[PDB]
Amino acid sequence: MGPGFDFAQAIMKKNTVIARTEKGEFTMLGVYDRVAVIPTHASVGEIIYINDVETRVLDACALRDLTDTNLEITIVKLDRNQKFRDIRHFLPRCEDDYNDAVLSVHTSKFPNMYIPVGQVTNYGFLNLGGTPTHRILMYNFPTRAGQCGGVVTTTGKVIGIHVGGNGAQGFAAMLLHSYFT
């Protein structure tokens, strides 16, 4: 409807796939070459389904900060015959707060879904499903089962991936440029 949704749509149409593990269907953001991200609670194994295609996982790394605290991002390298558009120049360099964010989801259950979530707080520490987690962003939208891995954008920046909610607020893990050098 406006430039928020325009940027979000442009990321969803070229840089997302549907990832299926034994723990469910997730929006998965492709970042560059054959490298993508997914919430660590997807429990990626040796094989993953990508748009319902059996795909070997060449490498998977659950990120933690230098306090050895969970960040809830897994970086995956996929044995895929095609590269993602490189979107690393849209990733923030530092932890920050944001205005006017959009959360975008694409699954069998929620196709072409775009949610205007509004102001995004650098929340920091969250006990996420019992796991101490750092670099959490918070937005005041009642997000639901099926939105995990959803992409959080502002006009011009890809800032996080949706990892949970408490029924009133939603939470995303930060994406930082330094993760993908």
UniProtKB/Swiss-Prot annotation:
Q: Which domain of life is it from?
A: Viruses
- Peptidase C3 domain location is 2-180
Q: What's its catalytic activity?
A: Selective cleavage of Gln-|-Gly bond in the poliovirus polyprotein. In other picornavirus reactions Glu may be substituted for Gln, and Ser or Thr for Gly
Q: Which residues form the active site?
A: 41, 72, 148
Compartments where located:
Host cytoplasm
**Assembly and interaction partners:** Interacts with host IFIH1/MDA5; this interaction inhibits host IFIH1.
Tell me the function of this protein: Major viral protease that mediates proteolytic processing of the polyprotein. Cleaves host EIF5B, contributing to host translation shutoff. Also cleaves host PABPC1, contributing to host translation shutoff. Binds and inhibits host IFIH1/MDA5, thereby inhibiting the type-I IFN production and the establishment of the antiviral state. Cleaves host MAP3K7/TAK1, resulting in inhibition of TRAF6-triggered NF-kappa-B induction. Cleaves host TICAM1; this interaction allows the virus to disrupt host TLR3 signaling. Cleaves host IRF7, resulting in inhibition of type-I IFN production.
Name of the protein this chain belongs to: Protease 3C
Source species of the chain: Human enterovirus D68
Source species taxonomy: Viruses, Riboviria, Orthornavirae, Pisuviricota, Pisoniviricetes
Which portion of the complete protein is shown here?
1549 to 1728 of 2188
